[PDB]
C-alpha cells in the first residue's frame, strides 16, 4: 500500500514534469508566475500535501506556502533526479509521515532543468 | 486497500492530464488528436498506464494507445457522471486482463465539460 501511494506521488510528479506549461515556464524571467497556479491546481485536485517544482539546485519555484517560494529547497537527495532518474522516498514533515515521488524536468535537448517533487501524507 | 490506491493512481493521472493547458486548448483545434495523442502517449509511457484515453463529450477517442483506434473507439463504461463534472473510478476488463481506471472531466474556461480523460492500469 505504501508502495502504491509512492506510485501515486511519482505518477503525479512525472505527469507535471512532462506538461508543456512547466517546461516552458523555465524560460520566463520569473517561472513562478506560471508554475505556482498550475502546481496548486494539481495539488488540490490530486489530494497531495505538496507539488513542489524547483530548479536544478532544488530552489522552489512552486510551493504550497507561497511565502516559501524562492527560499525553500526540495528536501532529500536530488542527485539521482539530476541524473534523469525518478525516485520514490519516504519523508516526514510537521504534518506527519509522507511518501514522495521526484521526477526530472527535461528541456528540448534532454538536459535536466528542474525537479518536480510530489508528496502524499501516509493516511487512508 | 491496494486496489483502491491503484484507482486513486489512475484518477490522479487523469485529473492532472485533464488540468493541463495543452489538453484544454486542443479541443479547440480542427484536429485535436494532433496535439492530444503525443501528450497522452508520453504520459502513458511515463506512468506505466495501460491507456490514457482522451475523448469528446460523446466519448469519441481523440487519443488512444492504438492510433488506429482514434475516432473509432469510444471511452468505455458509463460517462454520464463525468459529463456532470464528476470524477469516477471503476473496474473493467480487456484483452490484457483486469484493469482499474479513473475518469476525469476536462473543463473549458467557463467551467463547461468539453471532454473526458480515462486512465487505466492493469491489475498486475
Numbering used by the authors:
A (entry chain C): 34 to 157
B (entry chain A): 33 to 156
What's the paper's own text on this?
Membrane bound histidine kinases (HKs) are ubiquitous sensors of extracellular stimuli in bacteria. In accordance with the naming of the PASc domain, the periplasmic domain is termed PASp here.
We used a bilayer-embedded CitA construct, referred to as the CitApc construct, that contains all essential elements for transmembrane signaling (PASp, TM helices and PASc) and the fully functional R93A mutant. Previously, we reported a piston-like motion in the PASp domain along with dynamics changes in the PASc domain of CitA from the thermophilic bacterium Geobacillus thermodenitrificans (GT) upon switching from the free to the bound state by citrate binding. The contraction of the overall β-scaffold of PASp leads to a random coil to α-helix transition in the PASp/TM2-Linker. This result is in agreement with the conversion of the disordered region downstream of the last β-strand in the PASp core (residues 152-158) in the citrate-free state to a helix (P-helix) extending to the TM2 helix, in the bound state.
